[PDB]
Design a protein around this ligand. Structure first.
Ligand SMILES: [Zn+2]
Length: 212
């Protein structure tokens, strides 16, 4: 099992149907890495920490990736993720700290910087910095700018250790406080840069092989 065979949103049917839990519509065209499909996706969008499976000698996936209020079980989630019927699956990624910001809207679809990082498709991405907040209006600007994307996101992952910095994302913005989709990163992360957003994404979106 190479890492290429472990992307949670692109698992082969053999690997999927083996997993055991431990206890084109947007183009009107009948083509997924083409730049055409990507703009149409863009146009239409714009208007223990783990769970374990058994198979081929223990695959682990982050609990944060799932929807807590969901009646589906994790196998049902994985199979729905791996079906062409969710081509506009997106998530958001935000880190702020020490005057630095990086945000991105990430597509769940992969592509052709390591090869694993080179396949992360950021539909939008922004990074800026301000000494000191005054960052607050800048970031509230990005959130309004991405409002159509944000209302269609599966998850919105935010790192803001500072209490005033976490307040930046919900104090009178387009995100509401107590939005289930808003979640911490289940692992420590570095400085807010675009590459760090991709590190975080690859860390959430690939199964991990662990001991039982
Ligand atoms: Zn298409």
């Amino acid at each position: 099992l190479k890492k290429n065979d472990l992307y949670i949103f692109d698992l082969s049917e053999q690997l999927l149907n083996s997993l055991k839990l431990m206890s084109c519509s947007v183009c009107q065209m009948s083509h997924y890495q083409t730049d055409y499909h990507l703009m149409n996706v863009k146009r239409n969008l714009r208007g223990s920490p783990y769970i374990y499976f058994k198979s081929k000698y223990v695959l682990a996936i982050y609990k944060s990736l799932f929807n807590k209020r969901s009646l589906s079980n994790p196998n049902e989630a994985l199979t729905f993720w791996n079906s062409q019927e969710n081509p506009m699956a997106i998530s958001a990624l935000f880190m702020v700290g020490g005057g630095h910001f990086a945000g991105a809207i990430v597509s769940h679809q992969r592509l052709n910087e390591t090869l694993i990082e080179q396949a992360v498709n950021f539909l939008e991405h922004k990074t800026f910095h301000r000494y000191t907040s005054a960052l607050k209006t800048d970031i509230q600007g990005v959130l309004k700018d991405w409002e159509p994307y944000l209302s269609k996101c599966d998850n919105i992952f935010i790192r803001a250790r500072n209490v005033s910095d976490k307040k930046i994302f919900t104090d009178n913005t387009v995100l509401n406080k107590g939005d289930e989709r808003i979640k911490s990163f289940p692992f420590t992360t570095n400085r807010p840069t675009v590459l760090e957003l991709k590190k975080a994404w690859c860390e959430l979106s690939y199964l991990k092989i662990l001991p039982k």
